[PDB]
């Protein structure tokens, strides 16, 4: 009667705590994976940025050597 | 007439029912007495899970018969 | 059944789904709510990316579970 009711309420409280634990375990696992995925995507774009970085600095070094040759030539 | 509803923890409810009462009326009487929603209740008697639309006389449930109550509390 | 989708911008979306819905069908429902094309959506649950062909029941995603939405490039 009352005791069947009390046993049902205890089991409902027990299931609710089990669902909060799975919800927390799921969220902890997903945020850890997402943080890992975002760090990998940020690292990949930085390496693409540095590849363009040394490409333009190579171009600047080449432009400086040409600028030096032009300055010696046109200054009589 | 009187029938009994026993859980797997040994706790037993007594219900006053009519032989023409459907199993759904029985689950409703359990909710009125224990607050357990009928969608969480499963009733077994004489080796069969009982269907909501069928009557107690359909399952040959007479006076002082004992039904077994199973709760669906996880996954649903 | 009801599930939730949490975005990286702090919004939670609510979707009405059945356990046999595929992940692509879930992505379609997100498009109905947010206008995000399904090919740009990555859904994550329990630390893993979900495959479009698989159903929610295959991943044991039950009612009121929370999916994580991450968008592509």
Numbering used by the authors:
A (entry chain A): 113 to 188
B (entry chain D): 1 to 76
C (entry chain B): 1 to 73
The authors write:
In the current model, the E3 Ub ligase RNF168 recognizes these polyubiquitylated proteins and then ubiquitylates histone H2A, which serves as a recruitment signal for 53BP114–19. Recognition of ubiquitylated products by RNF168 relies on three distinct UBDs: MIU (motif interacting with Ub) 1, MIU2 and UMI (Ub-interacting motif [UIM]- and MIU-related UBD). Currently, it is postulated that UDM1 and UDM2 interact with different ubiquitylated targets: UDM1 is associated with RNF8-dependent polyubiquitylated targets, whereas UDM2 recognizes RNF168-dependent monoubiquitylated targets. In UDM1 and UDM2ΔC, the simultaneous interactions with Ubdist and Ubprox provide the specificity for K63 chains.
On the other hand, the other two crystal forms (forms I and II at 1.78 and 2.25 Å resolutions, respectively) contain two stoichiometric UDM1–K63-Ub2 complexes in the asymmetric unit. No large conformational difference in UDM1 or K63-Ub2 was observed between the two crystal forms or between the two molecules in the asymmetric unit. LRM1, UMI, and MIU1 fold into a single-continuous α-helix, whereas K63-Ub2 adopts an extended conformation. LRM1–UMI binds K63-Ub2, where Ubdist and Ubprox interact with LRM1 and UMI, respectively (1250 Å2 and 1090 Å2 buried surface areas in forms I and II, respectively, averaged over the two complexes in the asymmetric unit). The main-chain amide groups of RNF168 Ser111 and Arg117 hydrogen bond with the main-chain carbonyl group of Thr12 and the side chain of Glu34 in Ubdist, respectively (right). Note that the Ser111-mediated interaction with Ubdist is missing in the form II crystal, since it contains only residues 113–188 of RNF168. RNF168 UMI interacts with Ubprox of K63-Ub2. The Cα–Nε distance between Leu71 of Ubdist and Lys63 of Ubprox varies from 12 to 16 Å in the different complexes in forms I and II. Although the difference in the Cα–Nε distance (4 Å) suggests that the interdomain region between LRM1 and UMI tolerates some flexibility, the positions of Ubdist and Ubprox in the UDM1-bound K63-Ub2 seem incompatible with the binding to other Ub-chain types. Therefore, the co-operative binding between LRM1–UMI and Ub2 seems possible only for K63-Ub2, unless the α-helix conformation of LRM1–UMI is distorted.
